[PDB]
Structure formats: C-alpha cells, structure tokens
Write a protein that binds this ligand. Sequence first.
Ligand SMILES: Nc1ncnc2c1ncn2[C@@H]1O[C@H](COP(=O)(O)OP(=O)(O)O)[C@@H](O)[C@H]1O
Length: 230
Amino acid sequence: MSIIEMRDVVKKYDNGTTALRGVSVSVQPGEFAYIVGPSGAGKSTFIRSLYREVKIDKGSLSVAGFNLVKIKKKDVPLLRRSVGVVFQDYKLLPKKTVYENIAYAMEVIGENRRNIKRRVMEVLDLVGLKHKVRSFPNELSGGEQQRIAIARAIVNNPKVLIADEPTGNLDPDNSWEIMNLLERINLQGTTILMATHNSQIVNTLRHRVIAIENGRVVRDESKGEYGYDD
Ligand SMILES: Nc1ncnc2c1ncn2[C@@H]1O[C@H](COP(=O)(O)OP(=O)(O)O)[C@@H](O)[C@H]1O
C-alpha cells in the first residue's frame, strides 16, 4: 500500500494560475523519486501539497497515512512530524551548535529528552559530522550545513523525507556527498522525494523520475533519465 497517493489533484492559485492540473502519483514506502521539470512547472506546489502548506482544490491526497482532504487544522502538526522537509533555503539556528540544532528538532515535536543524546549522536555518525558536534552553522561549509539540515529533517525518523534542490548551491564533490547521505537514508527505508535540476545526479544515481510540465505529469519512469536541457 502506498505512502503517498495523489489522484487527479488540482491546485489553482487565486490569480487564476492552475499550478497542478490533474496530477496522479502513487509512491510506495521506501521509494526514491526525483521530481524534475522546467521552472514554473509546479514542482514546489507539488512538494508543498505533501505537507499541507498547499491545500488542494480537487482530487484525493494521502501522505504518511493522513488524508489531506479531511485533515483538521489542529492536526497538521501531526502530519508534519511524519514528513521531514529540507527547505531549499534551509537555515539552521545560528546561535545553536550542531548538537543543539539537531536536538531542538526532537524537543520541538515533544520527544522525551531521554531519547535525545543517543539519537543526535547516531544521526551525526550517519552524516559523518561527529567532529562538528560543537560547531555553529557559520563555521560549517555549505555542504556541511546541508548535511546538518538533513540530520534535523530525519531526526524523528519520519516516514517521508522531502528535499527541495538539496545540492542546488553545492559543487560536484559536495553534491555527491549529499546524495550519498540521501541514498543511505533511503536504504534504511525512508521514502525520499527530491526536486532537482542536476542531470548528472539523476542520470548516474538512477531512481524513479517524475517529470512535471504546466501542471501535468508528462513522464514517470523507473531508473529514469533526466530528459531536459536545463
Ligand atoms: N503563491 C503563488 N501564488 C500564485 N501563483 C503561484 C504561487 N506559487 C506558484 N505560483 C504559480 O504556479 C505555477 C507553478 O509554480 P511552482 O510550483 O513554484 O513551480 P516550480 O517549482 O516548478 O518552479 C507557476 O505558474 C507559478 O507562477
């Protein structure tokens, strides 16, 4: 049974722009999917519908178990606990150390403080930054900051992880390091949806590719090629 089920979804913004124009996508638990397509296609609108920042107008949508057509306002935080998000402009808390940043991601969802030390150190092992446990974000490279943003996003073991252009401002070597981390997270079972314009990553680290244009899925292929010139 699917962890994300989108059927005939429509989203039209108030200025009349139909950003999702009948979108159907079914993602099984543990899948890794790239979301690709030209600027303005609807990738961000698609991503943001998955954590209920965007409300759909028509269609059905279930994410991480939750029916997003029916979900009550007060329960959106429960959906958010199950959906880790690496914002394209993810900003760490500048006056918190790496440890405090990751720990806060647990405290803020109500986790027991008793669970924090073990989990934070486990995720620092995962991302390979145990030695930066006391660093502040400004002391880290861009690639290190992104790895800590990913650590924050997965700290509560969400069912789904969404990453909006996680390598978009990283050089090739750092981009591959972020991809190695996301791949290891996926092998642990976490479902990953990643919006991206990096054809080399998509064409080399082959996964499912969902291409969106003008609000429509135009291609949905296993181990897919990138398919665009930009
Ligand atoms: N907040 C908004 N209000 C109105 N129109 C929007 C808004 N966000 C996006 N759009 C429009 O919806 C379409 C899809 O945008 P977006 O989802 O950001 O695409 P992408 O992420 O692929 O660049 C575009 O025509 C865009 O201008």
